[PDB]
Amino acid sequence: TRTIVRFNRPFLMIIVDHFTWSIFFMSKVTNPKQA
């Protein structure tokens, strides 16, 4: 059975540039609707 990847709990995001290897943004999403 194929792998399911389900981002329905807190997760991290690291936006990267392959050319310069910069990290443009880093994020932790603990609540997408957090006040």
Partner: protein, 338 residues
């Protein structure tokens, strides 16, 4: 630029860990490259211990590189990020807002323009509301309206503000079909959840790594152009473990361990988050101290030890949706007389 990427990524994860310490359960969003560039710009005017502390805090090895090499590396980074592209919208700018009567070294303003692309805009900080609006308007313009209130408080006795912004707008290489977006649970904890629009993709071949050391799943999604994003999904109650192990070494291991896998289904929320920060405490924790005290040495700005940092602030926004991602951030360094 491997030496710049190594320092900048070390700095990114050191910042992340301190940001989480301050508010452990909150969302986090920030731009490490914006903060690094703004503090490198500040270091152009720094001398002696003030300068050493900034460059060390940015995670450069000062036994192996020079200030000159570092500034040239940020000049090259800025030129590369601002290059024309049809695929991705990416922009980074620097500016300095300065009281007209403050005497600046010609070498400083010339170097600020040449290396950091910064003009020097005469600003009347005694008209505080107007100075605040001017700086916020500069940031609003650079971020296409996405960062609106970088400057909240602004001391009427401010002498200078250094500003960096970054704007990023990208399309997914494999965009989500909005017809497949459905309201679904997002678990805040094991027994509490909210409903969010959950986008999905089916039978998607992407780089994938199940990290059994840290109990998390890593996937890489590409944007059109040279940018991509690592998404890391800790197992339930493993977020703290993953955070504790974040490092350049860990990121390198993840990147080295990805293999292509045809995922049955990928579910990702559509969302927008924002955060703003006063970075003084974290920068002091990273050893950047003298710039904030009455021992500050910013004499490369003016020729005299007559300036000190009051605050470093950062704001960042992240929007993830079916077509792609929009993210922006800005950093300001507020400077007073000494």
């Amino acid at each position: 630029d491997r030496g710049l990427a190594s320092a900048n990524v070390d700095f990114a994860f050191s910042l992340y860990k301190q940001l989480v310490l301050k508010a452990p359960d909150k969302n986090v969003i920030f731009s490490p490259v914006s903060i690094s560039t703004a503090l490198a710009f500040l270091s152009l005017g720094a001398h002696n211990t003030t300068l050493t502390e900034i460059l060390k805090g940015l995670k450069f090895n000062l036994t192996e590189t020079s200030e000159a090499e570092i500034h040239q590396s940020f000049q090259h980074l800025l030129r590369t990020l601002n290059q024309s592209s049809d695929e991705l919208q990416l922009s980074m700018g620097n500016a300095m807002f300065v009281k007209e009567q403050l005497s600046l070294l010609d070498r400083f303003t010339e170097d600020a323009k040449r290396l950091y692309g910064s003009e020097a805009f005469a600003t009347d900080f005694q008209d505080s509301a107007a100075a605040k609006k001017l700086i916020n308007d500069y940031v609003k313009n650079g971020t296409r309206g996405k960062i609106t209130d970088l400057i909240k408080d602004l001391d009427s006795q401010t002498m200078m503000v250094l500003v960096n912004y970054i704007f990023f707008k990208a399309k997914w290489e494999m965009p989500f079909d909005p017809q497949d977006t459905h309201q679904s649970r997002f678990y805040l904890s094991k027994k509490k959840w909210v409903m969010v629009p959950m986008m999905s993709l089916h039978h998607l071949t992407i780089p994938y790594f199940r990290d059994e050391e840290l109990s998390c799943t890593v996937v890489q999604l590409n944007y059109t152009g040279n940018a991509s994003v690592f998404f890391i999904l800790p197992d339930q109650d493993k977020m703290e473990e993953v955070e504790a192990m974040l490092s350049r070494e860990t990121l390198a291991r993840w990147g080295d361990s990805l293999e292509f896998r045809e995922i049955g289904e990928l579910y990702l929320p559509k969302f927008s988050i924002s955060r703003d920060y006063n970075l003084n405490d974290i920068l002091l924790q990273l050893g950047i101290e003298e710039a904030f005290t009455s021992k500050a040495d910013l004499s490369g700005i003016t020729g005299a030890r007559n300036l000190a940092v009051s605050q470093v602030v950062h704001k960042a926004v992240l929007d993830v949706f079916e077509e792609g991602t929009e993210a922006s951030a800005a950093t300001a360094v507020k400077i007073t007389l000494l």
